[PDB]
Amino acid sequence: NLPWVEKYRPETLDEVYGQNEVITTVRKFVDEGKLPHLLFYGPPGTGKTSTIVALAREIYGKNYSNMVLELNASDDRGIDVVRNQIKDFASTRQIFSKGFKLIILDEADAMTNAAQNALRRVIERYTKNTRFCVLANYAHKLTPALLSRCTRFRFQPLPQEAIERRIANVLVHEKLKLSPNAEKALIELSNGDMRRVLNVLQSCKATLDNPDEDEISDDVIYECCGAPRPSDLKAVLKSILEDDWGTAHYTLNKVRSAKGLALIDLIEGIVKILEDYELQNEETRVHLLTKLADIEYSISKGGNDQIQGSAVIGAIKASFEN
């Protein structure tokens, strides 16, 4: 009953896909015994936590629970916890250990400047008796002094090959059949995120399988994760381009109401479709991009959605007159 996000977790190093460039380096590092503080940063759903826990396991064997300190985000860590708990764990010597202790902080980019300064000073004071590992989604939100203390590793999202290999593996260990276009829709909607793939697969498994042998189509995978449809997107685009105001407005409202989509997804899909058009004038593209970015930035602040939708329609129509 454990989730596929947790059941298909790589238990060692060789079971993480699409990150060979960092896997070989960390293997060499743990083989030479010169393991420094490591800053694993990158987009979510890539494998940072799995990689670091697998490395800690491979290093410590059964001493994992006694030689590894897993710490998380804010958790009411104003200044107190970083000052007492981490400092003691870095200062308290183990009873029967030959080596160094490891403390891994997940998503530590949410720490305040004072907390980050306390953490970097703690790392500086006890850099010889323990090693630190910091996980992050955005490397810019961290103090530039903490970056210059450890070695950085960016986790570029998984390419198509790793994701399709993992889909194959999850199809081996589970009685499901997947349509040829289903995996295409999955890789297009995933954006290199394995977590979302493993989340959406179990959902369709739970809802669709009456005899546990059906075929998953594009319709259900588009409906469950709440994503737009290319045909619907192109129809909305054509209705805005060619038809008049009443018809285009009515079609846009009907699409955004009968399916439950948001204006952000509509805007990004519309500009993605417009990226490849062979328009004559460049001022057209300039005005289109400028106005669409303005509409998106205004939507980001929660305005009256009908007005921004009418503005989207007006901008799309007024840009195509050259």
Partner 1 sequence: QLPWVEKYRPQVLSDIVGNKETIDRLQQIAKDGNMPHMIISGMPGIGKTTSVHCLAHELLGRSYADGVLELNASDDRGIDVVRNQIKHFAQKKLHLPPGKHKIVILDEADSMTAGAQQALRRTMELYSNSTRFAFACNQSNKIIEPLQSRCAILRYSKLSDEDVLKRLLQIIKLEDVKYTNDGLEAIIFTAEGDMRQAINNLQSTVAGHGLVNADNVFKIVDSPHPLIVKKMLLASNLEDSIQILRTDLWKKGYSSIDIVTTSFRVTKNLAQVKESVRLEMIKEIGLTHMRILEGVGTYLQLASMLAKIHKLNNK
Partner 2 sequence: PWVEKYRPKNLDEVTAQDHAVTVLKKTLKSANLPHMLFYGPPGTGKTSTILALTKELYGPDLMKSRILELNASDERGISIVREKVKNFARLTVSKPSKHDLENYPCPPYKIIILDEADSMTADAQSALRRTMETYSGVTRFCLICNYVTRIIDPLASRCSKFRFKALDASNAIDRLRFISEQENVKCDDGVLERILDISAGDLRRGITLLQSASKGAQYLGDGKNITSTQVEELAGVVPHDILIEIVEKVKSGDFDEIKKYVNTFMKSGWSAASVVNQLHEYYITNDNFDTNFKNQISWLLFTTDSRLNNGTNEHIQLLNLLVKISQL
Partner 3 sequence: REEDKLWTVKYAPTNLQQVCGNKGSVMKLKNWLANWENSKKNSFKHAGKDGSGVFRAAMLYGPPGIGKTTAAHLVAQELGYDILEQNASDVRSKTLLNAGVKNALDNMSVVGYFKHNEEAQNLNGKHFVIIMDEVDGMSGGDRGGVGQLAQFCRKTSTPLILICNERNLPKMRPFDRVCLDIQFRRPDANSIKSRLMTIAIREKFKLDPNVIDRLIQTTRGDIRQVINLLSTISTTTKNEISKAWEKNIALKPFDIAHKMLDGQIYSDIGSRNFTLNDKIALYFDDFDFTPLMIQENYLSTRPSVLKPGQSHLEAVAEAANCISLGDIVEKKIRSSEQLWSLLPLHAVLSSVYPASKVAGHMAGRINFTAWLGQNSKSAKYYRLLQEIHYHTRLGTSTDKIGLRLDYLPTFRKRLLDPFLKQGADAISSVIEVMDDYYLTKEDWDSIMEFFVGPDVTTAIIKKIPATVKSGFTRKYNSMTHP
Ligand X SMILES: Nc1ncnc2c1ncn2[C@@H]1O[C@H](COP(=O)(O)OP(=O)(O)OP(O)(O)=S)[C@@H](O)[C@H]1O
Site string for partner 3, 122-141 (x = CB under 8 A): ------------------xx
Q: Residues within the annotated binding site for ATP?
A: 5-9, 17, 42-50, 137, 195
List Cβ neighbours of 63 (8 Å cut-off, separation of 6 or more). 97
Give the binding range for partner 2 (CB under 8 A) out of 3-11, 123-131, 177-185, 264-272.
Answer: 3-11
The answer to whether 54 touches 9, Cβ cutoff 8 Å, is: no
Asked if residue 278 binds partner 2 (CB under 8 A), the reply is no
* H or E element, residue 216: strand 215-216
Taking Cα atoms as reference points, which of 303, 233, 274, 283 lies closest to residue 311? 303
| DSSP structure class, residue 62 | G
H-run or E-run covering 68: strand 68-71
Q: Based on the shown chain and the rule CB under 8 A, indicate whether residue 302 belongs to the binding site for partner 3.
A: no
Coil, helix or strand at residue 69: strand
Residue 154's beta-bridge partner residues? Answer: 41
Phi, psi values for residue 110, rounded to 5°: -90, 10
3-state helix, strand, coil split of the chain in percent (to 5) is: 60, 10, 30
Give the per-residue contact string, 249-278, with partner 1 (x = CB under 8 A; - = no): ------------------xx--x---x---
Binding site residues, partner 1, CB under 8 A:
34, 36, 43, 83, 87, 113-114, 117-118, 121-122, 125, 138-140, 143-145, 147-148, 151-152, 154, 156-157, 192, 267-268, 271, 275, 282-283, 285-286, 289-290, 292-294, 296-297, 300
Binding site for partner 2 (CB under 8 A): 1, 3-6, 73, 75-76, 195, 199, 202-203, 206-207, 224, 226, 244-246, 249, 257, 260, 291, 295, 298, 301-304, 306-308, 310-311, 313-315, 317-318
